[PDB]
């Protein structure tokens, strides 16, 4: 079910990237990599137990704790709302994949 999020949020991020490119041309990239305002990526882990199996739980920046932001680009708000919004979907997909592997 959550696999479709990896397409929907990706399409939204692509649209935001096109809008940002139309706004400010080429992004700064390089030193700060530009393209975002949120997503100071740092991941935290937790261990849940279901039927005696230690199913891991995953949280990270823009999908939990350890998140920070500063300024951003022109469409940096739109980029965060689309490109950084896929972070929650990615974290959920990663948690689901880890749980599936452990359960298997």
């Amino acid at each position: 079910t959550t696999k479709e999020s990896m397409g929907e949020v990706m399409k939204d991020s692509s649209f935001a990237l096109i809008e940002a490119k139309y706004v400010a041309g080429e992004n700064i990239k390089h030193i700060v990599l530009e393209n975002v305002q949120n997503a100071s990526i740092k991941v935290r882990s937790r261990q849940e137990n279901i039927a005696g199996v230690k199913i891991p739980k995953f949280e990270y920046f823009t999908d939990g704790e350890t998140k920070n932001d500063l300024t951003g680009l022109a469409r940096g708000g739109q980029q965060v709302q689309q490109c950084r919004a896929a972070y929650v979907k990615a974290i959920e997909l990663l948690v689901e994949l880890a749980s599936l592997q452990t359960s298997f």
Partner: protein, 268 residues
């Protein structure tokens, strides 16, 4: 009036014809426009200022390093000319109008040009210096267009500061100290912390009134896009281009806008 026929008439006619003909595809169009501009080489100073316009951003990008070698890939002669890290900044301080002022204003180098926000501040300061230099060369109707562009950039920077960059030390004082009627009445935007407040500040200029409108688009973007998008929408005024006047900058702006539109087209 007779000076136009005395000199510059052929170049003006060639520029007018090229503009009238205008309407990796985006990269190819940009390269063709840059080649057309270069082949055209009083008006020399205007061309130098027009090139320095984008050369300020090109030099700001090259100031990195940090994957600095990638700057050669975007070496478009229109803005990324080779002639236009404090040790390298001093060397790059030559052959540019805004560089000597930025040498003192941005003497902290990367400290005052951090890639997160302070690099944008240095770019805005350089843009303000370039706009001041261009406005110094007064004598034509392009002064109004240059003032409108500088006002749009300053207002967009102020709106971005009030929206979210206020937490990034872009306070009311920084709305003009670092963020590049505006050259005399920009103080009204120092307290426009809300979209409704932005519209109220825009109400001080009846031409700027109703330009913000609902502010859902254009003003929604940070950096210099808020009031710059208003100038992009109103660029139909630049499309007039009355004859016997400096229209090289107008043609360059129209070509840049066409390139941007082609890029925004992309895969439909």
């Amino acid at each position: 009036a007779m000076t136009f026929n005395i000199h510059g008439g052929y170049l003006e006619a060639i520029v007018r014809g090229y503009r009238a003909g205008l309407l990796t595809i985006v990269e190819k169009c940009t390269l063709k426009l840059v080649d057309e501009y270069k082949h055209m080489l009083p008006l020399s100073t205007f061309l130098e200022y027009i090139t320095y316009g984008h050369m300020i951003d090109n030099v700001v990008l090259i100031v990195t390093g940090r994957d600095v070698q990638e700057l050669l890939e975007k070496c478009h002669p229109l803005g990324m000319f080779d002639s236009i890290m404090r040790e390298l900044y001093r060397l790059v301080l030559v052959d540019t109008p805004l560089a000597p002022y930025f040498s003192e204003c941005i003497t902290s180098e990367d400290l005052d040009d951090m890639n997160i926000e302070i690099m944008r501040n240095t770019l805005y300061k350089a843009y303000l210096e370039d706009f001041y230099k261009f406005c110094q060369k007064l004598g034509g109707a392009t002064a109004e267009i240059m003032s409108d562009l500088l006002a749009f950039e300053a207002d967009r920077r102020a709106v971005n500061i009030t929206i979210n960059s206020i937490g990034t030390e872009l306070t009311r004082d920084d709305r003009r100290k670092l963020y590049s009627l505006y050259p005399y009445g920009h103080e009204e935007l120092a307290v426009c912390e809300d979209i409704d407040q932005v519209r109220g500040v825009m109400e001080k200029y009846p031409p700027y009134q109703s330009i913000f409108s609902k502010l859902s688009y254009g003003e929604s973007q940070m950096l210099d896009k808020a009031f710059y998008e208003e100038e992009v929408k109103r660029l139909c005024l630049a499309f007039e281009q009355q004859f016997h006047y400096g229209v090289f900058f107008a043609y360059m702006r129209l070509r840049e806008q066409e390139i941007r539109n082609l890029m925004w087209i992309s895969e439909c």
